[PDB]
Design an enzyme around this catalytic site. Sequence first.
Site, PDB file in Angstrom:
ATOM      1  CG  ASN A   1      -2.021  -0.993   1.161  1.00  0.00           C
ATOM      2  OD1 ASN A   1      -3.009  -0.815   0.451  1.00  0.00           O
ATOM      3  ND2 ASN A   1      -1.864  -2.077   1.913  1.00  0.00           N
TER       4      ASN A   1
ATOM      5  CB  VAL B   1       1.632  -3.151  -5.432  1.00  0.00           C
ATOM      6  CG1 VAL B   1       2.234  -4.117  -6.456  1.00  0.00           C
ATOM      7  CG2 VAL B   1       2.073  -1.725  -5.717  1.00  0.00           C
TER       8      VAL B   1
ATOM      9  CE  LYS C   1       2.416   2.635  -8.783  1.00  0.00           C
ATOM     10  NZ  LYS C   1       3.606   3.362  -9.337  1.00  0.00           N
TER      11      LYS C   1
ATOM     12  CG  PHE D   1       1.154   4.024  -5.375  1.00  0.00           C
ATOM     13  CD1 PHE D   1       2.187   3.946  -4.455  1.00  0.00           C
ATOM     14  CD2 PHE D   1       0.522   2.857  -5.762  1.00  0.00           C
ATOM     15  CE1 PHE D   1       2.593   2.726  -3.937  1.00  0.00           C
ATOM     16  CE2 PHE D   1       0.923   1.634  -5.251  1.00  0.00           C
ATOM     17  CZ  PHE D   1       1.962   1.569  -4.338  1.00  0.00           C
TER      18      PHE D   1
ATOM     19  CG  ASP E   1      10.891   7.837  -5.113  1.00  0.00           C
ATOM     20  OD1 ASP E   1      11.543   8.375  -4.193  1.00  0.00           O
ATOM     21  OD2 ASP E   1       9.934   7.060  -4.892  1.00  0.00           O
TER      22      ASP E   1
HETATM   23  C1  LIG Z   1       5.725  -1.973  -3.956  1.00  0.00           C
HETATM   24  O1  LIG Z   1       5.587  -1.031  -5.057  1.00  0.00           O
HETATM   25  C2  LIG Z   1       5.783  -1.437  -6.312  1.00  0.00           C
HETATM   26  N1  LIG Z   1       6.099  -2.727  -6.550  1.00  0.00           N
HETATM   27  C3  LIG Z   1       6.278  -3.171  -7.811  1.00  0.00           C
HETATM   28  C4  LIG Z   1       6.664  -4.582  -8.072  1.00  0.00           C
HETATM   29  C5  LIG Z   1       6.731  -5.061  -9.376  1.00  0.00           C
HETATM   30  C6  LIG Z   1       7.127  -6.381  -9.580  1.00  0.00           C
HETATM   31  N2  LIG Z   1       7.465  -7.171  -8.532  1.00  0.00           N
HETATM   32  C7  LIG Z   1       7.437  -6.710  -7.257  1.00  0.00           C
HETATM   33  N3  LIG Z   1       7.794  -7.533  -6.252  1.00  0.00           N
HETATM   34  C8  LIG Z   1       7.834  -7.392  -4.911  1.00  0.00           C
HETATM   35  O2  LIG Z   1       7.411  -6.392  -4.333  1.00  0.00           O
HETATM   36  C9  LIG Z   1       8.419  -8.515  -4.079  1.00  0.00           C
HETATM   37  C10 LIG Z   1       7.848  -8.701  -2.667  1.00  0.00           C
HETATM   38  C11 LIG Z   1       9.246  -8.103  -2.855  1.00  0.00           C
HETATM   39  C12 LIG Z   1       7.042  -5.400  -7.017  1.00  0.00           C
HETATM   40  N4  LIG Z   1       6.166  -2.337  -8.854  1.00  0.00           N
HETATM   41  C13 LIG Z   1       5.853  -1.045  -8.678  1.00  0.00           C
HETATM   42  C14 LIG Z   1       5.652  -0.569  -7.402  1.00  0.00           C
HETATM   43  C15 LIG Z   1       5.333   0.878  -7.272  1.00  0.00           C
HETATM   44  N5  LIG Z   1       5.151   1.431  -6.068  1.00  0.00           N
HETATM   45  O3  LIG Z   1       5.301   1.571  -8.276  1.00  0.00           O
END
Ligand SMILES: COc1nc(-c2ccnc(NC(=O)C3CC3)c2)ncc1C(N)=O
Length: 333
Positions: free
Chosen positions: A29, A35, A50, A32, A140
């Site tokens: 969370n 996810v 997302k 934005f 970021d």
């Molecule tokens: C947590 O925020 C985000 N997380 C992802 C993302 C994409 C693909 N795989 C993961 N994997 C994991 O989080 C694993 C558990 C560690 C995350 N992508 C974009 C965001 C964003 N905030 O834009």
Amino acid sequence: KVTTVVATPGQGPDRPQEVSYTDTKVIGNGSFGVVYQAKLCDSGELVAIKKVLQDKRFKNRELQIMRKLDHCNIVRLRYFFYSEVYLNLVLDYVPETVYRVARHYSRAKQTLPVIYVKLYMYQLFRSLAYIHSFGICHRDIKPQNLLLDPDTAVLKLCDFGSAKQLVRGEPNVSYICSRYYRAPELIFGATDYTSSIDVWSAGCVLAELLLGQPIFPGDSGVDQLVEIIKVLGTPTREQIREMFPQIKAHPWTKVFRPRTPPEAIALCSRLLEYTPTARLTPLEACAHSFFDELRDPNVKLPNGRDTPALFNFTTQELSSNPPLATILIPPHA
Ligand SMILES: COc1nc(-c2ccnc(NC(=O)C3CC3)c2)ncc1C(N)=O
């Protein structure tokens, strides 16, 4: 159980298709939104989804940027779809982040092996070289945005919610970037900053991986500044202009533990520089001697596997400095 949507493929022409996913669970969370993780029914492949509220008054910037990115160190937009209307970005799932992995080592009172520091940092600089060649600044860069597959040692940059193309002479907001990783010119509230703020952040991540803790901590800008100065020394009048307690610079070799590779420290010192134009470009960093081991034809991963893709540069990727190709692409590639 099973969710079926009509989603537009991330790359390629705008031709939507039915996509079915399942096993949806929340993994994050934020400001934005949310996810999720889900599993594609067709292939068993894991995706991250997302979910963000859609501006309605304009096209989503993150989506526009992501639809034109294609690089092996940037997480792939597979699809997007709509579901108060929401935009859903369907991304390749990656099981880890630099943040959780760095956390594992610090809690165990160990440092991440330098070979992983080399691999991870190098891939980060490639993602940056790539997005910077489009004039796009991520804005970021931080460990939570650096995805990792620990089996293949592949790193993928994620989260383009702050990303934006920086046009010379256009002002941009200084309140981007996350604490610890903010370039000093951001702290000073500069609105004419360049993509080199990404490089400063990347240097902070490097230093953190070597130290086992953040190099410039602090809950306020003034505390951060105080920590930067304790290391870099007091900026000059000219350095300030390019971007106070009178403190003499701490020798970089004394900032890190005794067993730290001097190449790692030399790289740090050329990333973490007051004057933004004096910092290495991402491509130059890629070519730094600290990464020479990665270019050794005999190098392998600790787990026995081959290194992941490291040398598949494109013309676009090299465009900031084409003759570096001779360093970057070794004879065995
Ligand atoms: C947590 O925020 C985000 N997380 C992802 C993302 C994409 C693909 N795989 C993961 N994997 C994991 O989080 C694993 C558990 C560690 C995350 N992508 C974009 C965001 C964003 N905030 O834009």
